[PDB]
Design a protein around this ligand. Sequence first.
Ligand SMILES: NC(=O)[C@H]1CCCN(C(=O)[C@@H](Cc2ccc(F)cc2)c2ccccc2)C1
Ligand SMILES: [Zn+2]
Length: 139
Amino acid sequence: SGAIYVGNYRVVNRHLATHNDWANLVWEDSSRDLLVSSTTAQGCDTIARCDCQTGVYYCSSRRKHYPVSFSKPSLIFVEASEYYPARYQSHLMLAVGHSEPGDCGGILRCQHGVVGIVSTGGNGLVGFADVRDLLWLDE
Ligand SMILES: NC(=O)[C@H]1CCCN(C(=O)[C@@H](Cc2ccc(F)cc2)c2ccccc2)C1
Ligand SMILES: [Zn+2]
């Protein structure tokens, strides 16, 4: 679990969005596994606006942060799960690292701010949904 809180927005994995997220829906994209909802309180997270390919992510299944080198956001095949049929997930970045069910929502950060959230894993890999292209989160 986990979310990004920036301005009057909450960014979560679309497959973990709650009834309240859908009632206050701003934007969602099944191909990216992202959903953004509106909030009443101000969020203070800073979104990175950069092309960093190194950062640190939080892994809830280890209660630890790990440094990672990750690929540029791209279209990657993701196997069928109870949440989605087999498909290409867009804007996904892969890295070598531990990730298991329950880790989605952990933040990946670089020196500039929040880069994205855990969205996929297994086999010693971890996949992050990028949020750096969503410039409207800042306004
Ligand atoms: N973005 C997606 O489509 C996710 C949705 C949840 C599932 N998902 C994952 O990759 C799971 C692994 C998994 C489990 C059962 C399956 F039938 C297929 C794959 C996972 C997420 C996070 C960290 C480690 C593993 C894709
Ligand atoms: Zn950066």
